Amino acid sequence: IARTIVLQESIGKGRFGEVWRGKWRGEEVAVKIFSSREERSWFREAEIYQTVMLRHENILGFIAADNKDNGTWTQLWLVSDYHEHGSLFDYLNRYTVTVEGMIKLALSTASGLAHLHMEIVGTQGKPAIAHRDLKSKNILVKKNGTCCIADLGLAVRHDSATDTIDIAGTKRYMAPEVLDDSINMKHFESFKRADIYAMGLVFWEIARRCSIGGIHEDYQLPYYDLVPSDPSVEEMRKVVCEQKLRPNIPNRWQSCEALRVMAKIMRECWYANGAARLTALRIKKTLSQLSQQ
């Protein structure tokens, strides 16, 4: 618990709160600390992570939510597993990946999203969940080369029985329908589809780093040469919705079977119409088969 955790190093900032590398009984763990005025964000994220049957190898492992009074003010804590590599963003900026490495990153990410999206029926049932803010900066890389999804604070949970959501993201990754406000937020399926579009962008970031024969593209965020670094909804909307542009597909990707499969998936994730996009499960299937080949 928070009572015996010692913070050692600042390792990042979340939408709200700061992330630290702490030690729990000698073991390294990750700690996200919120202020008293950020209680709703802290609570909502703790709520999502405590969803029944949520644990999965491709979802950040949640340890606990707690309060810690230092004598002057109260800190609101969330504790999880610690991954030295940090975000996929950091990973892709620092390294290049092999074909096998790329598939593992993409496959693990898709498996995590498919788990989130999938409703598990049963007495201890897991509701379908949509992320709403998927990006390379909140996907983490484990020591074994696989990814796990984090930052579930903006997630929404579905109630299949009544087809309603339990409650009422990053501009660059916002889906077309989100950018132009045409998305039907009363339809849970629309949130799932919007997540697919974002995963498509992430896949593009990974593929660029797939080095074959010492050849590869430099790391870049999707739309790096079409919009400013911290783009607004309008700037994104004009490019994605009006000009209808998507990340450029290097001709180099046509030389490798793996890259060809990855590219096809991306295209099928970027359709302006969410209903036309692939599902996380289908993507997982395709990547799983490619992995076997």
Q: How far is the CB of 77 from ligand 855 (least distance, A)?
A: 8
List of residues 6+ apart from 56 with CB closer than 8 A = 111, 112, 115
Query: Residue 41 or 138: which CB sits closer to ligand 855?
Result: 138
Separation of alpha carbons 258 and 56, rounded Å? 26
- What are the binding residues for ATP? 11-19, 32
Q: How far is the CB of 20 from ligand 855 (least distance, A)?
A: 8
Backbone angles phi, psi at 5, to 5 degrees: -95, 135
Q: Sheet containing 62-69: which strands, arranged edge to edge?
A: 5-13, 18-24, 27-34, 74-81, 62-69
List, as one string, the DSSP characters of 213-244.
Answer: TTB-PPP--TTTTTS-SS--HHHHHIIIIIS-
Separation of alpha carbons 165 and 188, rounded Å? 7
Q: Which spans of this chain sit near ligand 855 (rule: CB under 6 A)?
A: 11-12, 14, 19, 30-32, 45, 49, 60, 62, 78-80, 82-83, 86-87, 137-138, 140, 150-151
Separation of alpha carbons 139 and 132, rounded Å? 13
Separation of alpha carbons 160 and 170, rounded Å? 27
Query: Residue 151 or 205: which CB sits closer to ligand 855?
Result: 151
Q: How far is the CB of 152 from ligand 855 (least distance, A)?
A: 7
Q: How far is the CB of 251 from ligand 855 (least distance, A)?
A: 33
Q: Annotated catalytic residue: which of 66, 133, 159, 166? A: 133
58 and 149 Cβ atoms separated by less than 8 Å: yes
Q: Sheet containing 156-159: which strands, arranged edge to edge?
A: 129-130, 156-159, 164-165
Amino acid identity of 67?
N
- Among residues 184, 186, 188, the alpha carbon closest in space to that of 160 is found at 188
Query: Residue 82 or 191: which CB sits closer to ligand 855?
Result: 82
- What are the binding residues? 11-19, 32
Q: How far is the CB of 256 from ligand 855 (least distance, A)?
A: 30
Active site residue 225: no
Count CB-CB contacts under 10 A for residue 230. Answer: 9
Residues tagged active-site: 133
